[PDB]
Structure formats: C-alpha cells, structure tokens
C-alpha cells in the first residue's frame, strides 16, 4: 500500500496501534502546553489537562516553560489513573530531545502511568 | 531609528492615492542575496586572501568557498574547482546597511553624477553602476591596498514598472529625470 | 491475420496521400461496403484517383479509412529472415458496415458515377448510401 498523508508527515504511529493500547500526545503552544490520552479509532479523548487549568490550583509564573510542562503531566496522569488506564505510550509528533515533552513524559510516570 | 517607519507608516501612504487594493502584496522578510565580483582571471592564487578579509569588515561572519555540482558539460570545466563563493544571511541585519549606505559618504565622493538611466524595464531586480574608488565612513582612509568596488542589488516582487521605485526615492537619492 | 504496424523496419512510401476536397465543414455522407476486407494502399489510390478524376465538377470528397497494417513477403528458399516489406505495403481494415469515401454533397449526386468507377477497382461489393 501507499503512504497515507499522515504517514508522510510521520506524525502518527502504526507500531503503537498494533498493541491496542492508548497514547499520550503532547501538544505544544508558544503560550500553553497540552496533553491527552487519546485511544484508537478516531480522536477519543479519555482525560486531558491544559497548563492554563493549572492556574485553577495555584499557578503564578508563565505557562510556557519546562517546570510547567511537568506540572501538566502530573495532572493529566493523575486524572488518567482515576479513569481506569494504567499503561500508555509516548507520542510526540515532531520535536527535539530533553525538551518539554520529556518533562511531560517523566511527569506521567511520576503519577503511576 | 529611521528605518522602522518604512513598514507601518510610509507603506500605507504609498498604496492609497495610486493603488486602491489591499494591504499586503505591496511590498516582507526573506534573506537578501549579496553576490561578489568575479575574482577569476584577475590574478592567480591570491586575491581570495584580501577577499573575505574586506567583506568581513562591513558585515559579520566570513564568506564560504563552495564548488559546483560534479557534472561535466559543454564547457571547459574540471571536477573539483572552487567557484562562486556566495553567502547570504539575515534575520534583522539587512535593514541598517540601507541607512549608513545611502545617507553619509554620499553625496561625498569626488565626482558624483545625480541622474540615473532607466535600469530595469519589465522586472523587479533593479541595477547599479559604481566605480572603483569609493569613500565610506566605515573604512580607513590610508592603509587599504587595492580599492574594491562591488555593486548593489535589491530583490522585489513587483508586477508593474510604476507603483515601484516610488519607495526607493523615499530615502535613497539622488535621482533626477 | 493479427493486425500489424511497424516498430520494426521502415518500408516503402504511401501510394496515397491527396485527401482532396475542402475541410472547412464536416459532413456525414459516405459509401458503405457490405463485408470485411483488406485493401492495399495501391488499390486505394486507384479507386480514390478514379473518382477524384471524375468529380472535376466540384470537390468535398474525402476518405476516412487508411492503410496502417503492413504485410511482408518472402521470395526464394527459407531458413533465415522472417519477412521483408515488398509489393505488399500497408493495408486498410474495412468493417462489414464501414464508410470509406464520403463526399459533402446535397442531393445533386454527380459523383455516383465516380464512386461506380472506383467501386470496380476495390475487391468488395460496395453500395451507394445517401445518409
């Protein structure tokens, strides 16, 4: 078969769909950072939390740094464990290393994922 | 300084009395290419030294020596011969060299004209024509051997002869008819 | 005979050519021939040149089918040399109900006598059609 438009952009991952589990997409914005736990077959979002929502707790500083990306990971993951999910793979479509995505992943494990 | 007003103030005015359109298209960023004068022929293994040595004073960084693509054609060319040697970069630099270039030192040469012929005809890339002896405020008056004279270009995406050059004569003079 | 062409070797030239008549207006007349048959370029010229040499009154005479199927022959012994292109040049394939020569003309038929002369040159019983 040919390479779908998505495969050409290599943003997706078929190797994580062969397992039949969930993902941990990490959206990044020059103002905010977002994370989700979408499941196969469309865009089924079970749990998610934005850095802007972190303010609801008691956030003061900017929401576009590293320490903020780690705070969101603990929130999205905490809510995930409350849902019923245990395992999850990391899905960072295009990005560098040691960036905010790594801090997001390291935060997810800190919760229990 | 006197360079910011040309992309917010003196850009809408030159698009109202004789244009009647939108806001964009006239005139952006994108790097500006600065070519060098053919160094070939002049002399032998040299000149390249005094080169990049003077082209690194008016600006930053040093030019790179790149060759062509190994593909012999219907011309006298071997495989692996340094030719061209071009390096162009920007970001916010190509904005000041449009100030200290056409303000001081000119008029202040020795026999400057004032009237220029119609360079281009049906394009965007203008033209130029400077001699070998030039006097700049960013160059020593007595210590430079072999005077250098490089041209000056400017890339633009115009569609008609008019509607253009009206921005050039908005800071870069003289230019009589 | 499996239809043929070239993509092989160059043979003789066309004994035909002169389409004749003016093509500023496209008509829908013709001279159908009941029965399929292979006609060589030469015989096509004799028939075409027969009517054209008779329709001096006017023109508008045209042909749709042309020879595009070569046929090689072999004279002598045999054991080295598929086939060369000799007298047997290109040949046209005519269908049981195909229109060959059609002349743009309103009921004033002065070429029926011409088509008759040509109808006696091609190996196939042809019939005159008005539509």
């Amino acid at each position: 078969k040919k390479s779908a438009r998505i495969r050409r952009a290599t943003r997706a991952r078929r190797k994580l769909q062969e397992l039949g589990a969930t993902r941990l997409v990490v959206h990044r914005t020059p103002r905010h950072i977002y994370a989700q736990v979408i499941a196969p077959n469309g865009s089924e979002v079970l749990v998610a939390a934005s850095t802007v929502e972190k303010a609801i707790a008691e956030q003061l500083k900017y929401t576009g740094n590293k320490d903020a990306a780690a705070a969101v990971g603990k929130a999205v993951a905490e809510r995930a464990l409350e849902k019923g999910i245990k395992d999850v793979s990391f899905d960072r479509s295009g990005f560098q290393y040691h960036g905010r995505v790594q801090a997001l992943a390291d935060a997810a494990r800190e919760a229990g994922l | 300084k006197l360079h910011d007003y040309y992309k917010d103030e003196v850009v809408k005015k030159l698009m109202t009395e004789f244009n009647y359109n939108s806001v964009m298209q006239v005139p952006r960023v994108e790097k500006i290419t600065l070519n060098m004068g053919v160094g070939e022929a002049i002399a032998d293994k040299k000149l390249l030294d005094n080169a990049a040595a003077d082209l690194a004073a008016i600006s930053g960084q040093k030019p790179l020596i790149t060759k062509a693509r190994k593909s012999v054609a219907g011309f006298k060319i071997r495989q692996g011969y340094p030719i061209g040697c071009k390096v162009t970069l920007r970001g916010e630099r190509m904005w000041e060299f449009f100030e200290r270039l056409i303000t001081i030192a000119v008029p202040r040469i020795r026999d400057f004209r004032g009237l220029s012929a119609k360079s281009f005809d049906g394009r965007g890339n203008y033209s130029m024509g400077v001699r070998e002896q030039i006097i700049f405020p960013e160059i020593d008056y007595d210590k430079v051997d072999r005077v250098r004279g490089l041209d000056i270009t400017i890339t633009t995406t115009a569609k008609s002869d008019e509607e253009g050059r009206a921005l050039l004569a908005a800071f870069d003079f003289p230019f009589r008819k | 005979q499996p239809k043929r062409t070239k993509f092989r070797k160059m043979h003789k030239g066309r004994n035909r050519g002169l389409a004749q008549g003016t093509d500023v207006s496209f008509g829908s007349f013709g001279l159908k021939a009941v029965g399929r048959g292979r006609l060589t370029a030469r015989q096509i010229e004799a028939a075409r040149r027969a009517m054209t040499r008779a329709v001096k009154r006017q023109g508008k005479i045209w042909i749709r089918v042309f020879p595009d199927k070569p046929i090689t022959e072999k004279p002598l012994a045999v054991r080295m040399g598929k086939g060369k292109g000799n007298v047997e040049y290109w040949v046209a394939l005519i269908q049981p109900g195909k229109v060959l020569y059609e002349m743009d003309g309103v009921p004033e038929e002065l070429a029926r006598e011409a088509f008759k002369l040509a109808a006696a040159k091609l190996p196939i019983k042809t019939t005159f059609v008005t539509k």
Binding site: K1, R14, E18, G20 | - | -
Partner: protein, 84 residues
C-alpha cells in the same frame, strides 16, 4: 552500459511461488503464503485485496505478516479462533 531496444520485461523462467497457510487451522506466526519476498505489517489474518474481497481465520499467535503487495498485503486488525 545503458539499455536499449524498447520492450516490456525480459523473459525469465518458471514462476516459483505457492500459497501455504490455510489460516483455518493451526498457524504458527510465520509468512502465510509465498510469492514475493520482503514485507511486514499484518500480525494476524488480514486478507484484504482490491476485488470481491479476501479472508482467513482462527489461529491465536502474535504477529504474522504476509508476502508483499499480493494476496491482501493490507494490514487489518487482530483475529483468532473463537476462544483460544
């Protein structure tokens, strides 16, 4: 050096390919069929090729690619007996 004389392929021998893998009985995770080498994706029964369709069935065993762009090269999604 270069090629010449236009044409289709270039004549060979007798095709060497089969169609092993009933995929309706016991099936160890291995190449189900034989025609063209090099290909992955299918981990179970995924017989799906342009046409009236394709199919396979029953056999619990992780992974099980096909031959290549032939008998249903596409990769479906899981399948086993009925209750391994």
């Amino acid at each position: 050096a270069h090629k010449k004389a236009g044409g289709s392929t270039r004549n060979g021998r007798d095709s060497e390919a089969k169609r092993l893998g009933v995929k309706r009985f016991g099936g160890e995770s291995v190449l189900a069929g034989s025609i063209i080498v090099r290909q992955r994706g299918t981990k179970f029964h995924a017989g799906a090729n342009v046409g009236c369709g394709r199919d396979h069935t029953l056999f619990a065993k992780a992974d099980g690619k096909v031959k290549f762009e032939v008998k249903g090269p596409k990769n479906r999604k899981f399948i086993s007996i009925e209750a391994e």
